[PDB]
Design a protein around this ligand. Structure first.
Ligand code: PRO
Ligand code: PRO
Ligand code: PRO
Ligand code: PRO
Ligand code: PRO
Ligand code: PRO
Ligand code: PRO
Ligand code: PRO
Ligand code: NA
Ligand code: NA
Ligand code: NA
Ligand code: NA
Lengths: 257, 258, 259, 259
């Protein structure tokens, strides 16, 4: 039952703590100021530390919940002495070692906001210093707020797009369907209820089936019907290309960070 | 209080609601396009068949129509109905149905979707002037057997057809597009599909139980100077929302024309 | 005998293409061109008898096949007096309309063949009016089976079939030519580029035909992750290949409807 | 005997597809997966011997075929010690690069097959380095001829061939699926729409193959003036079918180049 410290606590880091609370481990947090630390510690019902170093001094494992562009500034004056888990997009384990040390085991995760309901899809990977013992204990941590995917580091930026960023794309999609409902006479809340329930069921039906999404499309598209009319419209306007180009842009950005 | 329910025409959609119907106390019987088809689907479904549509009509408390909208006029006019009828067909009004079957029948429309297969359809229900408070409740019990039921007015049925009946296909094309982007970028199709399907399911579930709007979540996920806002502005640039909305418009136009 | 006499009024490219198949049947054939001069000319090319006029043809024949274009039906048919079942191959003209030109007392049939009739591999739709008996339709199916395969298609689906089977060979050729031209752009001689793609098209279609896998199933198989195929496929998506084809089929069908 | 022992390192979809053809040869086959577990698993599926490791495979075999993806060549090959001619099927990796991974003392060959190897109708390019004798190339051609046809293609043309023959089946499938989907839109069941178009695609390509006419010659033949085909063809032009295909081939080739 180790002691875990979280440096930087924004929305992603907060979403993860709910799940970490259901582990046997003891937790402590450290924010961007002492006042911010207290604020967040209050709403999570967890202790906080007097500084990042004070956190580092008492803790067996550190989780970094700060944004990637703050890594160099925030991390360089600190002296780490335990394994570190980064959740940051774009920053390689090699680059992290440059900031914190060549003598530490380092892990990356890529969770998403679904950690809020303990249903994150989280990628996990570690550097050469990560024993199978340590990787296992971290996997136990990630499994506490959803599922875990053994993902080689070269695939992290893609996974960031497919799983970390995609909930927002999924929400834009649902929102577009609901807005189309409003355009055509159905109240927003009601359209959103219908659409969300349909998304949920469709995804569950796919999960438990051996059929492909394209097999399902075939079943739903009655000849001369309404679905095939709308599907050909989605083809005309480039639905697939649009999603793919957005994914590419997500990945480009991850790379340049 | 147990009915005999007869199904005329059994396509993919009619087959999909059968599972739910089988969990009801009611007795069921079917009739396809020929006698040969009738026995093939009786075999497939472990349900008794009638010798004809009229034979079915003559012995049944309630009729569900599973035939395609384009076949209504041809198949229904020769027949003599003697009980409440449920149509699941896109784009055919109860008024228009009444001209096919009689002005003396209680008539209901439903709009289900393929998720009836897992008993998780989102189904619209409405009835004509001749449906009692009590009959619509009896039918709501039917539709609840294969998912959820929405009491929506008939003027809204074409929009509901797009939002719930057709949209699983649009959802699947979206899922497939995310997964193909994974393949393009070096992730095996099976794996890519597992990740995104799980993310879609969790995202929808979080939305449902949260008080936050879709746009509220987008704000939370879009870290300043991050990856999500980059991809989000690309979706804006290429017209994700306009594209979806135009597709729904086309779906509705088609329903109107049917 | 089982042999009947078959007369063909108007012989363009499509009518010529089915002749070869009709020659492999037990039947006697005779033709009639747009003029007596045209008739002799093409009777020579095909090695077949000609008639002195359409009505002369009609007076001796057991079955008429019309090879004239849809636009000429009214002009050419109305003056004639028909006495036997007629087969039309024209796009966009219903059996109901044909009967108004030709008579309400005749068995009438529609076919929709394609240029692959040339090598006896047409994909041909077949339908008949209420006057066509089972025996007659089977006799006509035997005719259509002589230059390809035959599909029992409802008349309401004829315009769509026209697009999918009658017009699509041209669309398939354009697509094949596009791939070969892309080979030329990138350093491969036209002839060699056409040999490679045509062979790949043939093999791919046979594979599809004998498999239980869908086209999309095959696409998943071929698209190695991070590979060359998925890159080309996403470019097809970006530029709207599927939308383009579907829009072209809609225009084909709109045309069939307005004819 | 004339029988040699052939070992396959890495067996994905493409390597599996050529196995069937290799079984119809007189040679002895052995495989090696990405792990000992994977090896046993797939040796069962194919009914073939497996090796305990890639090097174990190498030590007993007369010829190695590589079925691993281009991205893994460096990682997987460098630790191994090869002792025999090697055939690579990987897109975008030159014989020069392969020799830097594997040795300057080996005969090395490249092939570019496609998934039609499944029905023994691959369109397969073949080339060899300076170390490959006439006897060896002929022996390898015999191997490739077992699962399709074989083209003698210069290495400088391999990326283009990859697009025209290796990746294009997926593009052909998308095009076929587009036509069938257009049939669904317009009232024809998917299965039936796919049967009609696939048959038309097959027949059209055979017609082209055995004819002296160009694709464009055929297009002229099919496009009846004021007809349905020319309407659909001008819509193909408007929406840029040819440009789309060619652009997709360029992206395929760019990808091959960057691999
Ligand atoms: O909701 C419906 O009516 C359609 C019919 C086929 C698939 N679902
Ligand atoms: O495509 C159609 O026409 C039916 C009705 C909605 C879902 N499937
Ligand atoms: O996975 C992450 O790191 C991002 C941060 C905000 C939403 N989820
Ligand atoms: O937008 C970003 O940068 C973080 C990482 C994925 C989702 N939220
Ligand atoms: O030629 C090749 O190598 C590819 C691999 C998957 C499908 N065919
Ligand atoms: O997509 C790829 O990379 C492999 C090589 C050509 C066909 N399949
Ligand atoms: O089916 C037809 O009628 C057309 C005429 C020229 C080419 N094939
Ligand atoms: O283009 C046309 O009108 C004829 C009919 C289909 C093929 N050729
Ligand atoms: Na980066
Ligand atoms: Na309507
Ligand atoms: Na017409
Ligand atoms: Na390359």
């Amino acid at each position: 039952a180790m002691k875990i410290g979280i440096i930087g606590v924004g929305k992603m880091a907060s979403a993860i703590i709910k799940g970490l609370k259901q582990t046997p481990h003891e937790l402590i947090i450290s924010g961007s100021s002492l006042e911010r630390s207290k604020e967040i510690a209050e709403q999570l019902a967890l202790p906080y530390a007097m500084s990042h170093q004070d956190l580092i001094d008492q803790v067996d494992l550190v989780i970094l919940g700060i944004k990637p562009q703050l890594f160099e500034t925030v991390l360089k004056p600190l002296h780490f002495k335990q394994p570190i888990i980064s959740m940051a997009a774009g920053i390689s384990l090699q680059r992290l070692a440059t900031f914190v040390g060549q003598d530490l085991p380092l892990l990356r995760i890529m969770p998403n906001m679904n950690a809020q309901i303990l249903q994150s899809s989280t990628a996990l990977t570690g550097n050469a210093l990560v024993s199978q013992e340590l990787q296992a204990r971290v996997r136990d941590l990630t499994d506490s707020f959803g599922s875990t995917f053994d993902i080689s580091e070269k695939d992290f930026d893609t996974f960031t797009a497919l799983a970390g960023s995609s909930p927002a794309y999924i929400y834009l999609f649902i929102e577009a369907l609901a807005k189309a409902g409003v355009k055509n006479g159905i109240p927003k809340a009601k359209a959103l209820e219908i659409v969300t329930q349909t998304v949920l069921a469709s995804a569950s039906n796919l999960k438990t089936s051996s059929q492909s999404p394209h097999d399902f499309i075939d079943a739903i598209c009655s000849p001369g019907g309404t679905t095939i009319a709308g599907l050909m419209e989605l083809e005309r306007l480039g639905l697939t290309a649009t999603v793919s180009s957005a994914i590419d842009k997500t990945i480009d950005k991850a790379k340049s960070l």
